[PDB]
């Protein structure tokens, strides 16, 4: 790759998260239990994250070196390298929106101070405990009054139109979606001057500095409410088979199965038309499972099943182990031993045992034994050093 520079980072819109993925993951199952080939449309697919064995379809109709780019018609695997099973992505299509637990519960609530809403009220709306108004018009209600279950119901009998109250994660997508960062930007450029308070006109310049970021950056506000959650590639959360029959799954195939299952049921209750005591309990139950995936622990700590330690979500993988996940690198060509004295050496030399130096400098030694003609080929040099 070319001499890049300037890693650039920004929010991700549902029309882009739909652009990384190669297909929709629409079942919770992983493999087959009888022949361990992975199932179709499940988490570990082959039509989605590429093939399993290098250069061959899944059924077994395309193995020859003639067919090297075609996609099989039986099971639509593309016959390419199994390395590409490591850099593709899927995506789940949420049946209802849900707040991004980072941009909702990080201490300065980026959903909060973008709306000027106390965080204890947003949380009272994301659990479906208290209605919230949208577009009040000509009535006795602002744009963000918090009508409790009665006050709305004691308000709804009078007005039927010119008025809209919502509740839940699909409400904050309504507040953000209609709010405009230019009207309340310059209109707050005046409001800051009138205010005479060392605390008021000090936090007041904090909000107006956030609105001034959501415009030049190019991020709309309503992208902090997810609508298509993207799934990792199936070789960074492996299901490798141990020796003896047991498998050693990563702790993400326990969390992804818990979103695709709950999201799959909530697709059903809207077709079976259950009452709003259950489906309203479904979204409240889904949204706790998407936020147990991003950063598990800022909630009831959904501990692992079949065991008693907490699961390890995505944001608990970058998070410090005292340092980074990348390079802040175990290393080849190394060794270690017990040091001793050896006081006959010069200042610029150290001992090194024959049994070690013959093991670090192996690829160099292979050069001489094939350069001086002592070994015909490299396989015949590996047996001369052994």
């Amino acid at each position: 790759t070319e001499e890049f520079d300037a890693i650039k980072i920004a929010l991700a819109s549902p029309d882009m998260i739909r652009s990384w993925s190669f297909g929709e993951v629409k079942k919770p199952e992983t493999i087959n239990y009888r022949t361990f080939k992975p199932e179709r449309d499940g988490l570990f697919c082959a039509r989605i994250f590429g093939p399993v064995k290098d250069y061959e379809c899944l059924c077994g109709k395309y193995k020859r070196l003639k067919h090297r780019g075609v996609i099989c018609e039986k099971c639509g695997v593309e016959v390419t390298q199994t390395k590409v099973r490591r850099e593709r992505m899927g995506h789940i299509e949420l049946a209802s929106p849900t707040a991004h637990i980072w941009f909702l519960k990080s201490l300065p609530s980026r959903i909060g101070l973008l709306l000027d809403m106390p965080l204890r009220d947003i949380e009272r709306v994301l659990y479906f405990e208290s209605y919230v108004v949208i577009e009040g018009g000509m009535t006795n209600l602002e744009r963000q009054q918090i009508l409790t279950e009665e006050q709305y119901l004691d308000a709804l009998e009078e007005f039927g139109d010119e008025f809209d109250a919502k509740m839940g994660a699909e409400a904050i997508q309504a507040l953000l979606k209609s709010m405009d960062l230019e009207q309340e930007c310059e209109q707050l450029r005046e409001e800051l001057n009138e205010t005479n308070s060392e605390t008021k006109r000090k936090k007041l310049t904090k909000r107006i500095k956030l609105l001034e970021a959501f415009v030049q950056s190019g991020n709309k506000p309503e992208w902090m409410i997810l609508t298509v959650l993207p799934v990792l590639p199936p070789d960074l959360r492996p299901l490798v088979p141990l020796d003896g029959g047991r498998f050693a799954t990563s702790d993400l195939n326990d969390l992804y199965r818990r979103v695709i299952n709950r999201n799959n049921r909530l697709k059903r209750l809207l077709d079976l038309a259950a009452p709003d005591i259950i489906v309203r309990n479904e979204k409240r139950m889904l949204q706790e499972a998407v936020d147990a995936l991003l950063d598990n622990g800022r909630r009831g700590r959904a501990i692992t099943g079949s065991n008693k330690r907490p699961l390890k979500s995505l944001a608990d993988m970058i998070k410090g182990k005292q340092g980074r996940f990348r390079q802040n690198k175990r290393v080849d060509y190394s060794g270690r031993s017990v040091i001793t004295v050896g006081p006959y050496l010069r200042l610029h030399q150290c001992g090194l045992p024959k049994k070690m130096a013959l093991e670090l400098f192996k690829p160099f030694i292979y050069g001489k034994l094939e350069l001086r003609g002592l070994a015909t080929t490299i396989k015949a040099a590996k047996k001369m050093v052994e």
């Binding site: 405990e129 050693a248 005591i277 015909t376």
Partner: protein
């Protein structure tokens, strides 16, 4: 009252138990509401003269096998045994009732349907009848929704006035002349677009003929039926919110099976939502002793579906659970422990299926289980990977192309090309001999010879001296 509670189970109970338990006579009261509910619906399909149209082809093909004896009838109310008579009892009033308007024009068409009340239908096609007249709305609705825009936002006409004469009828010339007659600019402008406003509602003119009646009767046919379903929607909901306390009592026995508590009692709801769907009260059995089956039915079907990572089928979990119900019973009697063969005697498996059922049920160890001493290490740091290849295994295949490009270059020219085309050496897919023979243009069994004697030459020594060295 919202004392900073977080977990939903606190929020479920706090929201669920506001409602009150129903007395037994209350339950019969509610079911009698639904029982009038669907009767408002199905009796509001007899009003639809096309009610037998979707089925008259069935019985005109049931004998002739385009319909089966199950999905349309189940035993009439209040088989060649009954179908050949009751539907045959309809062949009299069938066309004779539509005879009048071929005045009592609506009595006969009603008289056919008036006796239709004793005709029993089946859950298969009941949906389609509701799906039939439903889309006729959208076929008439959005057209009528355009009548406003086509007359208001295009002619400047007001909307709330012309509807008085044309809505419901949907076919006459009400605003054709009555709207135009008022001497307004929009009315005189009505003659401008008077065709599209007249032609857009043409396909609905098929609709009234589609059921043969007027658009007025079609309105009450589809609209009066809607109250019947909504009569039951609020009815069924009243029973799901009432006995909702029950599922929590039935779903606590399964609290630890790999499924969360709150994913359990949501599975019972889809169960209990079906029980009251199929509930019948006339047998006298209280709702609890019938809803307890359909509820526990679900939570034992859900656990076999989404409890394992590597999912095992539903018919197998009955066999695994049988192996512990029986390997536990032999544990007390026998006292010591059970053997791999005594289960074969106690049960009736073929002595090896009990050896394949044992290599299944084990769950996957999590790849972050901290290994011994609880050091700064997990299990995922010790599982090497085998897809890769030894760089001395790749350094040979790179070296092998040296010999086969050099050794095979030490041949003749025309005899080396076919030696390279006969394998995939330095090329695409390999080839067939006479598939190659159309390349050298001498098509014969020579091609099986030229390679044949040439490959002998490389077989000789000192031409294979470097090539032999790759063996072992």
């Amino acid at each position: 009252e919202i004392g900073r509670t977080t977990d939903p189970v606190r929020m479920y109970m706090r929201e669920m138990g506001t409602v009150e338990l129903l007395t037994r006579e209350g339950e019969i009261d509610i079911a009698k509401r639904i029982e009038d509910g669907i009767n408002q619906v199905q009796c509001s399909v007899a009003e639809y003269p096309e009610a037998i149209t979707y089925l008259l082809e069935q019985y005109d093909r049931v004998e002739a096998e385009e319909a089966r004896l199950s999905d349309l009838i189940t035993g009439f109310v209040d088989d060649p045994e009954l179908a050949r008579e009751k539907f045959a009892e309809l062949r009299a009033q069938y066309v004779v009732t539509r005879d009048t308007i071929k005045a009592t024009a609506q009595e006969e068409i009603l008289k056919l349907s008036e006796v239709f009340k004793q005709f029993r239908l089946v859950p298969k096609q009941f949906d389609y009848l509701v799906n039939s007249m439903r889309v006729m709305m959208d076929r008439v609705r959005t057209q009528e929704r355009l009548i406003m825009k086509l007359c208001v936002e295009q002619c400047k006409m007001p909307k709330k006035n012309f509807i008085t004469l044309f809505t419901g009828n949907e076919t006459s010339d009400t605003w054709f002349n009555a709207a135009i007659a008022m001497n307004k600019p929009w009315s005189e402008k009505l003659h401008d677009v008077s065709e599209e406003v007249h032609r857009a509602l043409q396909k609905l003119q098929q609709i009234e003929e589609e059921t043969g009646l007027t658009i007025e009767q079609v309105k009450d046919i589809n609209r009066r039926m809607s109250i019947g379903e909504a009569k039951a929607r609020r009815a069924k909901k009243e029973m799901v919110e009432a006995n909702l306390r029950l599922v929590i009592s039935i779903a606590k026995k399964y609290t630890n099976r790999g499924l969360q508590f709150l994913d359990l009692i949501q599975e019972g709801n889809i169960g209990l939502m079906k029980a009251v769907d199929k509930f019948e009260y006339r047998r006298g059995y209280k709702f609890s002793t019938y809803a307890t089956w359909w509820i526990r039915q679900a939570i034992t079907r859900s656990i076999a579906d989404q409890a394992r990572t590597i999912r095992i089928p539903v018919h197998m979990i009955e066999t695994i659970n049988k192996l512990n119900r029986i390997s536990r019973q032999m544990l007390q009697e026998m006292g010591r422990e059970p053997t791999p063969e005594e289960l074969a005697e106690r049960m009736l498996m073929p002595e090896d299926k009990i050896r394949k059922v044992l290599k299944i049920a084990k769950e996957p160890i999590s790849m972050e289980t901290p290994i011994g001493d609880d050091e700064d290490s997990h299990l995922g740091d010790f599982i090497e990977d085998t897809t890769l290849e030894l760089p001395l295994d790749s350094a040979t295949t790179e070296s092998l192309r040296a010999a086969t490009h050099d050794v095979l270059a030490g041949l003749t020219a025309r005899e080396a090309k076919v030696l390279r085309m006969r394998f995939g050496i330095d090329m695409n897919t390999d080839y067939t001999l006479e598939e190659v023979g159309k390349q050298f243009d001498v098509t014969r069994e020579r091609i099986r010879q030229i390679e044949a004697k040439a490959l002998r030459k490389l077989r000789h020594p000192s031409r294979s001296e470097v090539l032999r060295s790759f063996l072992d």
